[PDB]
Amino acid sequence: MQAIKCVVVGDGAVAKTCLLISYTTNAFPGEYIPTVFDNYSANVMVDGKPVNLGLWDTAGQEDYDRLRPLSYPQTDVFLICFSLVSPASFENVRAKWYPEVRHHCPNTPIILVGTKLDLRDDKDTIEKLKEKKLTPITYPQGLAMAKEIGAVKYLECSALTQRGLKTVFDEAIRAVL
Amino acid sequence: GQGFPSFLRNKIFIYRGKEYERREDFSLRLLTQFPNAEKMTSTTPPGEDIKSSPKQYMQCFTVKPVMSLPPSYKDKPVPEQILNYYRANEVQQFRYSRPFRKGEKDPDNEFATMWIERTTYTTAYTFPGILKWFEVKQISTEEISPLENAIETMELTNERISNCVQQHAWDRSLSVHPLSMLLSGIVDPAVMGGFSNYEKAFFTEKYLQEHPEDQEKVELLKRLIALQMPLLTEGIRIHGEKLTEQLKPLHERLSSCFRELKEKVEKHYGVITL
Amino acid sequence: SRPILELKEKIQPEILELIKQQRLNRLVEGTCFRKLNARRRQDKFWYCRLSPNHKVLHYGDLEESPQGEVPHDSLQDKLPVADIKAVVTGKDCPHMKEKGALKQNKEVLELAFSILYDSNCQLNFIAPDKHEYCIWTDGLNALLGKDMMSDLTRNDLDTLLSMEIKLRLLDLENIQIPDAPPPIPKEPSNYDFVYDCN
Numbered sequence: 110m111q112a113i114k115c116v117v118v119g120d121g122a123v124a125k126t127c128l129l130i131s132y133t134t135n136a137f138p139g140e141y142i143p144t145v146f147d148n149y150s151a152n153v154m155v156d157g158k159p160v161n162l163g164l165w166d167t168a169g170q171e172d173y174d175r176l177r178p179l180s181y182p183q184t185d186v187f188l189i190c191f192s193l194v195s196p197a198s199f200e201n202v203r204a205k206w207y208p209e210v211r212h213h214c215p216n217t218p219i220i221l222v223g224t225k226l227d228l229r230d231d232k233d234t235i236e237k238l239k240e241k242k243l244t245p246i247t248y249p250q251g252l253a254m255a256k257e258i259g260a261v262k263y264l265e266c267s268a269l270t271q272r273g274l275k276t277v278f279d280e281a282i283r284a285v286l
Numbered sequence: 287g288q289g290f291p292s293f294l295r296n297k298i299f300i301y302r303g304k305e306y307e308r309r310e311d312f313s314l315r316l317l318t319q320f321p322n323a324e325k326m327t328s329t330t331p332p333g334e335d336i337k338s339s340p341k342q343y344m345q346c347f348t349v350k351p352v353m354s355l356p357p358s359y360k361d362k363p364v365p366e367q368i369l370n371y372y373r374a375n376e377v378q379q380f381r382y383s384r385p386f387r388k389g390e391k392d393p394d395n396e397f398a399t400m401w402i403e404r405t406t407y408t409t410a411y412t413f414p415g416i417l418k419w420f421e422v423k424q425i426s427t428e429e430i431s432p433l434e435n436a437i438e439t440m441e442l443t444n445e446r447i448s449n450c451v452q453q454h455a456w457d458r459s460l461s462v463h464p465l466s467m468l469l470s471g472i473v474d475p476a477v478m479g480g481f482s483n484y485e486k487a488f489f490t491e492k493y494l495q496e497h498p499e500d501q502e503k504v505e506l507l508k509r510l511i512a513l514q515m516p517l518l519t520e521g522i523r524i525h526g527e528k529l530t531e532q533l534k535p536l537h538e539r540l541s542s543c544f545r546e547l548k549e550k551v552e553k554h555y556g557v558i559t560l
Numbered sequence: 561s562r563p564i565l566e567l568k569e570k571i572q573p574e575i576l577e578l579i580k581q582q583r584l585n586r587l588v589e590g591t592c593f594r595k596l597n598a599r600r601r602q603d604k605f606w607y608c609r610l611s612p613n614h615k616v617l618h619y620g621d622l623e624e625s626p627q628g629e630v631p632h633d634s635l636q637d638k639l640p641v642a643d644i645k646a647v648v649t650g651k652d653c654p655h656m657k658e659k660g661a662l663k664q665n666k667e668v669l670e671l672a673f674s675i676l677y678d679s680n681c682q683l684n685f686i687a688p689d690k691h692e693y694c695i696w697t698d699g700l701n702a703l704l705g706k707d708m709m710s711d712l713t714r715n716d717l718d719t720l721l722s723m724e725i726k727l728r729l730l731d732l733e734n735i736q737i738p739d740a741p742p743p744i745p746k747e748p749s750n751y752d753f754v755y756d757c758n
Contacts, residue, residue, distance in 0.1 A: 111461075112461050112463055112464070114463060121477070126477050135308065135309050135348045136347075136348070137329045137347050140329065140385055141385075142383060142385055142400075142402075143396065144439065144480075145439065145475050145478065145479075145480020145481075145483060146443070146471040146472050146475050146480060147470065147471040147474065147475060147476050147477055148466075148467050148468070148470045148471030149471070150464065150467045150468075153306060153308075154305075154306045159305075159306055161461075161464075163463055163464065163466075163467045165467075165470070166471065166476070166477065167476070168474075168476035168477055173476070176474075176539065179532070179535045179536055180466070180470070180536065182532040183532065248680060265680070271310070272678075273678075275308055275310065314637070314638055317615075317616075318611075318616060318637070321613065321615070323615070
């Protein structure tokens with residue numbers, strides 16, 4: 110029996126914690142109960158044997174860049190995160206998140222993950238982004254960024270639908286495996 | 287629906303899934319059991335039209351195995367193993383929490399609206415049984431105030447910390463990553479500060495205008511966090527026993543914030559410790 | 561054979577549905593299908609069994625089984641039959657256009673078929689030869705509810721239609737069918753059948 114370290118970062122405008130807690134709770138979509146504390150954990154089998162799991166829920170704003178990297182050491186995998194519907198998140202990740210992550214741990218299997226997969230095709234959200242001159246960025250350029258890092262995988266999921274979310278985490282676990 | 291068999295139409299069952307059934311895996315298995323594999327989305331309430339309509343409708347979700355009552359076990363300092371066995375087996379009560387927004391949806395806060403309409407489920411027999419499933423026998427709903435939710439969350443956190451501390455206190459060849467896991471998550475409610483969230487929600491006199499007579503519960507929150515701090519103390523010392531160089535900056539952060547919260551609760555929250 | 565041909569192709573659909581139902585049976589019994597570039601210790605053989613209900617597909621990286629399909633819970637027991645956009649056949653498969661490590665050679669151009677699902681995931685598989693490739697595409701299109709794409713399917717259509725019709729012309733032996741149908745004798749408007757019914 111064993112456990113796995115796995116950190117998750119990202120800008121605070123996407124609420125990755127919602128995704129994490131919904132997954133760990135196994136709750137109905139859009140029915141998660143948000144707790145008060147971070148750094149969730151779970152115990153899942155992906156293949157062969159069940160494994161313990163621990164998710165490092167890391168606050169994403171710039172200041173905590175002094176405390177966040179101290180948890181990076183000996184993390185089996187890290188999961189870089191963004192919002193598929195936030196070009197600003199893309200700026201931050203390709204510019205700040207991804208570079209500093211590669212800096213701190215140049216040696217770690219990495220998976221890029223989308224968010225608000227439904228909102229990527231949300232017509233009202235798309236028209237709002239157009240009238241706000243933001244782009245509901247699609248997959249292929251995300252794939253291009255993934256190739257830019259050459260991450261062991263890149264996936265896109267959503268919280269309101271949990272689509273691929275299990276696939277996300279199974280890929281995450283099998284990354285070590 | 288109506289196309290369901292007689293003993294299935296407009297019925298509710300509880301299933302003793304596998305050890306690691308992610309909900310949608312079991313849902314897929316159930317769909318394999320049936321044509322008309324469509325999933326409802328109003329998970330809590332039934333559909334009156336579908337209380338008579340054909341085209342069988344279903345819905346599935348995990349529920350909480352309510353703790354059994356190990357007889358003659360209520361106070362003896364029994365090891366966990368028997369209890370963990372009692373967590374899932376020999377069970378007949380099952381609950382499901384119901385998120386609900388009740389009040390103003392102020393931006394920074396959600397704990398001003400949380401009202402859990404838990405749903406307790408009793409079935410005629412006790413898992414495990416001759417069947418891996420059973421029809422629910424009596425259904426019951428509940429109501430939970432944000433004060434209350436704050437309470438129950440708070441203790442369940444406390445017992446979780448106690449559980450991790452004890453399970454690691456019996457076995458030495460044990461990973462310290464769970465200690466980091468918790469100690470971090472509790473120490474910095476980084477995404478949102480739960481403690482200040484309680485303070486704004488109830489400790490503020492405003493709540494004591496909404497709930498003047500219902501302040502006998504905020505004192506319960508105070509006593510419960512009061513019992514929390516020493517548990518945090520044993521957590522800190524256990525970590526120090528299991529501390530490493532990478533955790534050393536982590537541990538000093540935990541220790542500093544821990545005594546900070548100590549003095550805060552003693553005077554800033556004004557709660558008296560034990 | 562002009563009246564004969566009219567009467568023959570005009571009662572078409574029974575052979576059609578029989579063919580497609582047989583195709584569904586063939587999918588259900590299935591086989592150990594072929595993956596992409598399963599060279600280094602990767603199981604090229606792997607079964608993809610259609611549900612007897614024909615709603616789910618039991619498939620995944622199953623072992624090199626020479627006997628074929630094995631009944632159990634495969635690596636993935638679901639393929640969503642309700643949302644498949646299509647299957648790409650031939651050059652339309654992006655993995656055929658792969659120019660790196662997954663370069664499917666020009667000897668599998670007719671063996672390339674990928675199931676379109678999730679709008680981003682594909683199931684890039686290979687067939688052991690042409691006839692079963694076309695058979696699997698037939699079965700999928702039957703799930704898609706459209707026409708068949710096997711030369712053997714047209715073969716079966718023509719041969720069995722000929723068999724059935726050739727059996728039907730026995731009553732009219734030594735007699736002919738006027739390509740202009742015989743004029744309908746006028747029916748008296750009264751329905752007062754002097755003798756009883758039945």
